[PDB]
DNA sequence: ACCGCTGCAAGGAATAGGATACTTGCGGGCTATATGGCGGCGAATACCC
C-alpha cells in the first residue's frame, strides 16, 4: 500500500496523476462550490477560475501535495475517525479505517 | 647661347623558379520501439443486488 495514499486518503490514481503535472487539485477550496480536495482537469480548472477569479487555491503537483499534506491536524483526525468507526459500517469499512487509525496513531 | 646629338631610363614580346595563399582529412576534445514463466496473494475495481 502507499502511505500517501491512505494517509491522504486519496486514491492513488489521482495521485499519480497530479504528481506527474496533468490534473488540479485544491487546496482549501472553501467559500464556493469546491470541496477540500476535489481534481480538476486543465481545462475544468480554467473554468473554475473564470467562473470564481476569489482567492480559491487549485494547486499541481508535488507543493500541492506537500501543502495538503502539512495543512492537517492528525490526532484530531484520529478522533473523528475512531468516532465515524464507531459503528456503520463494521463490513469493509471497518478494515479500512482500522488500517487508516493505525497509520494515523 | 642655342641645337641636334648620344645616351640613359620606361614600357612591349620570349623562358626558369621559389613563395605563399589555398584545400583537405584527421584526432583528439567535447556534450547528452517487445511480443517462449508460473504461482500466490493482496488491493483495486465490477457487478448486481
Given at each position: 500500500p502507499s502511505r500517501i495514499g491512505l494517509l491522504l486518503d486519496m486514491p492513488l490514481r489521482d495521485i499519480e496523476r497530479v504528481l506527474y503535472f496533468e490534473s488540479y487539485v485544491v487546496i482549501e477550496g472553501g467559500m464556493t462550490n469546491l470541496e477540500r480536495q476535489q481534481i480538476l482537469t486543465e481545462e475544468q480548472y480554467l473554468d473554475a477560475l473564470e467562473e470564481?477569479?476569489?482567492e480559491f487555491d487549485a494547486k499541481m503537483g508535488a507543493?500541492?501535495?506537500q501543502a495538503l499534506l502539512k495543512?492537517?491536524?492528525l490526532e484530531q483526525e484520529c478522533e473523528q475517525l475512531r468516532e465515524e468507526l464507531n459503528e456503520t459500517n463494521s463490513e469493509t469499512k471497518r478494515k479500512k479505517l482500522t488500517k487508516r487509525i493505525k497509520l494515523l496513531e
Open positions: 470564481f477569479g476569489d507543493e500541492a501535495i495543512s492537517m491536524d
